[PDB]
């Protein structure tokens, strides 16, 4: 994206906090200093796939999430005379 | 005069029914734009470059530059969020096991190839090689292109993780933890999700694997044969390219002034009357940039709608099995595979399609001992002399027993009741 | 104006003195004293994000 | 958390503040006060100075109206999405994945909010998984038995039938499986005895 002055490029990849660009993100980590690093897409997982093995869940959890959705805005009416021809 | 298709007249009878006797899995392709080209314009350099007097004269024309910069930053943030709302739907990167024997299905054309440097599938290579001095002239005038947050390699890794989760687990890695399961059992569950039983999947596993491999192999050449196949992604690139080209060419207009170069006006004309010649150019270029911004707003809104549609399809077609007709493919949706593409996503929908139908004689119910017998799960068909019960998507004739039908009332109110003897084990 | 001057490989004609672009801005010029085609490229600029 | 509702209010406030600040600009004229121009200039030529401000303010108001239309477009899109979710997540039980909450959708509760709606999705998430040995089918008397509704699992020595979302081991009986063909085509079928009540 460009030249970044003020952050030290570390090699350990963490979660993206302040998106800079091109996969590089900034963060404020430990004294204290601003570091830049390549963002990590998540933890690596290896499903033990097999032609005869299956995974059956033995318990469950009821989870209440929260999803916000806008509906409307503030109805605004403009008057030409008062806005343009002020007194 | 354009034709509306072929002309078929299916025979409708009150006793005839059509039952399919075979089937085919078809891998259809669907292209969906996700992101756009983030563009940032330099107000001063575009309106009047290399000019110190215009740099001071522009300050008296209101703060339109701040508005345009805020609009472009909002568009860039929206385009960056569109790439995460579609591909970054899982928080656990999965890995394909070394043994790639999934029952007989070959996913080599969609799994990443570690031979090439870029971790892209053979299909993604064709998708990236078909979506294509002019980017330096616009740079020298204020128009710059900002790089996306998630690079192509990260989107490829996200698609590979989603593919590994769909293959190894199925739809369990989208709801909760990734539950391991053999792929033939996953296909049996997909068949049960559309009505077909597990015996059709388990007795024709080799044929289904061969048909899937053939369809995957044909998709690779079908995407390369048609040139305008990847047009739904090249159109946005062409639109942004021409929108930048016309924005650059609008600087070649005088807008009623005597010239288009400010150094040609400041040198000959004195500041007293040079204002009436510079303000016209300033107003014209500001209006052109404002029109460009207000058009890119609508373009980014359309791209956001397309990205929301693509995210909903990724959540419903890949992370599960959607029964919505003509949403995850034309026909009985079985599964879907996502692939990355320049500013877009390609969904390969594997869909169940019946074929080789056959006509039989049907009846609403049968009566054995004065009581009606309605099919519990299936339909009663006839071969001309005998009566059997078979499912509604595959001809599997079975003897009519007390387990395949249920008794409900007497057989004198049903219009179409036929006499037949049921079996009792 | 303002810009960087660099020797260009543009093969001008004996009568051609200037050079335009898509936006009719002068990209190359000819030094009247010594015949040599230059290349007027704008000064280094960019964006500053904090 | 309530960032999807505060952004709309912030955008409206910024648009109103910009429309107000567009009155303190000259638009190429000498000042932004109408009476000052009318008292410092003559009526014949004051028109060429006041028309610039008139056109600038009219263009600013037109740009504000166009931006409000563009914003109302996505606001209507979000309102239609919220209505579809209220009809599918609250008025019933939708099987769409990642539409009424992350997981197996159970129910949803609506709540009002300033210019918005908040959906609390009560969802079902499996946990505490365990690994078992599965088989496509079994045959006892030379005829394959496929699970009617469930899956065959094994605990190392015995075979049971469990559902696809909870570990409930049940003895393999006749009314839990259906017979279709013999065990010569299914790849991976294991021999096991079935029960008959
Ligand atoms: C980080 O990785 C680069 C490339 O391998 C290497 O040159 C550099 O020394 C590494 N720095 C650290 C912090 O180890
Ligand atoms: C079953 O999977 C294992 C790896 O877990 C593999 O070694 C073996 O060859 C596979 N068996 C079949 C049926 O090919
Ligand atoms: C299921 O989970 C709950 C909460 O963790 C726990 O109290 C309960 O004992 C668990 N039951 C089983 C089957 O382990
Ligand atoms: C079903 O179709 C496949 C492919 O056309 C064919 O090989 C197979 O023989 C067909 N089976 C039946 C039921 O005819
Ligand atoms: C998968 O397909 C490719 C191309 O047809 C082939 O080279 C490869 O051997 C196949 N792999 C398997 C699993 O047979
Ligand atoms: C069923 O009968 C109709 C009318 O004769 C015919 O068009 C259709 O092809 C038949 N279907 C089959 C293949 O049995
Ligand atoms: C109908 O099915 C029965 C049992 O399979 C068979 O014996 C008979 O020949 C069939 N008749 C016709 C007309 O297909
Ligand atoms: C069915 O059988 C009964 C006698 O068992 C007879 O009265 C009736 O007419 C028959 N109906 C048909 C459909 O032939
Ligand atoms: C310009 O004039 C000076 C002095 O006579 C001379 O040294 C120089 O070479 C001339 N340049 C040209 C080539 O016109
Ligand atoms: C199943 O096996 C996998 C891989 O060894 C392991 O990660 C998982 O915890 C196991 N599940 C249980 C508790 O049986
Ligand atoms: C499997 O389950 C049966 C019946 O509960 C039990 O008798 C047997 O010991 C179990 N085997 C193992 C190893 O869990
Ligand atoms: C299943 O049973 C048959 C006959 O008893 C025998 O031939 C075959 O080897 C058995 N197979 C397995 C999976 O043990």
Swiss-Prot record, chain C:
Changing residue 23 to D: In strain: Alpha/B.1.1.7. It comes from the Viruses. Attaches the virion to the cell membrane by interacting with host receptor, initiating the infection. The major receptor is host ACE2. When S2/S2' has been cleaved, binding to the receptor triggers direct fusion at the cell membrane. When S2/S2' has not been cleaved, binding to the receptor results in internalization of the virus by endocytosis using host TFRC and GRM2 and leading to fusion of the virion membrane with the host endosomal membrane. Alternatively, may use NRP1/NRP2 and integrin as entry receptors. Binds to host ACE2. RBD also interacts with the N-linked glycan on 'Asn-90' of ACE2. Cleavage of S generates a polybasic C-terminal sequence on S1 that binds to host Neuropilin-1 (NRP1) and Neuropilin-2 (NRP2) receptors. Interacts with host integrin alpha-5/beta-1 (ITGA5:ITGB1) and with ACE2 in complex with integrin alpha-5/beta-1 (ITGA5:ITGB1). May interact via cytoplasmic c-terminus with M protein. May interact (via N-terminus) with host bilirubin and biliverdin, thereby preventing antibody binding to the SARS-CoV-2 spike NTD via an allosteric mechanism. This is Spike protein S1. It comes from Severe acute respiratory syndrome coronavirus 2. The chain holds residues 548 to 597 of 1273 of the full protein.
